[PDB]
Paper text:
Neuroglobin (Ngb) is a phylogenetically ancient representative of the globin superfamily found in vertebrates and predominantly expressed in the central nervous system at overall concentrations lower than 1 μM, thus excluding a role in dioxygen storage or transport. At difference with Mb, in the absence of exogenous ligands, Ngb is endowed with heme iron hexacoordination by two conserved histidines: the distal His64 and the proximal His96.8−11 This peculiarity of Ngb induces a complex binding kinetics and conformational rearrangement upon ligation. Ligand binding to the ferrous heme of Ngb is limited by the rate of rupture of the iron–His64 bond, allowing diatomic gases to compete for the vacant sixth coordination position.
We produced a neuroglobin variant, namely, Ngb CDless, with the excised CDloop- and D-helix, directly joining the C- and E-helices. We determined the crystal structure of the ferric murine Ngb CDless mutant at a 1.8 Å resolution, which according to Arcovito et al. is structurally indistinguishable from the reduced ferrous structure. The analysis of the crystallographic data yielded the observation of two murine Ngb mutant conformational substates (MON1 and MON2) in the same crystal. More in detail, the refinement based on the residual Fc–Fo difference map allowed us to estimate that canonical and reversed hemes are present in a 29:71 and 33:67 ratio in MON1 and MON2, respectively. Iterative rounds of modeling and refinement enabled us to reconstruct the protein segment between the C- and E-helices (CElink) of MON1. However, the poorly defined electronic density for this region in MON2 prevented the determination of the CElink structure between Phe42 and Pro59, suggesting a highly mobile conformation. Conversely, MON1, with a defined position of the CElink, appears to preserve the arrangement of the hydrophobic core, retaining the heme crevice observed in Ngb wild type.
Residue numbers in the entry: 4 to 136
């Protein structure tokens, strides 16, 4: 019931991944402008947006069994720690993801859809958090 809400809402976003990823990152810097220096240039920034959207694509494909990605996501967390990202900043990324989905879906972004996404994103960050251990 939750795996279908995620798949169906992600299909709408998948129609334009850099456009939607760009809304997510614009929200992220509005909330936590201190993050912007962690990036490099414009092509590096835009390519990172594509990389984030591909990781969420993999999380959506594996939504019924995210443990199959836990080692990959742990390594991703280690890489983010290595380049100076604080684990706390991932809560603001989650708020920015839910913002971008609400703007993309409007009234189709039901509380059940939001809650499903909150849980999926939380499982992704729980796996990544191991990289800060
Ligand atoms: C505040 C949040 C974040 C910051 C500051 C950040 C920053 C970075 C930086 C500096 C890199 C290395 C340079 C690069 O490849 O462009 C990187 C790599 C990456 N990030 Fe992020 N990141 C954030 C959140 C995320 C999230 C939430 C995901 C996925 C859900 C993600 C996916 C990636 C991927 C796939 C890479 C490439 C790793 C590799 O080469 O093996 N990022 N990120």
């Amino acid at each position: 019931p939750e795996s279908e809400l995620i798949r169906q809402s992600w299909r709408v976003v998948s129609r334009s991944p850099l456009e939607h990823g760009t809304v997510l990152f614009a929200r992220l810097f509005a909330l936590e402008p201190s993050l912007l220096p962690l990036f490099g240039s414009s092509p590096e920034f835009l390519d990172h947006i594509r990389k984030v959207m591909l990781v969420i694509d993999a999380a959506v494909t594996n939504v019924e069994d995210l443990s199959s990605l836990e080692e990959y996501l742990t390594s991703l967390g280690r890489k983010h720690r290595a380049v100076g990202v604080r684990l706390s900043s991932f809560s603001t990324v989650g708020e920015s993801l839910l913002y971008m989905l609400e703007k993309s879906l409007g009234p189709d972004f039901t509380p059940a859809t939001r809650t499903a996404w909150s849980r999926l994103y939380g499982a992704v960050v729980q796996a990544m958090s191991r990289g800060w251990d």
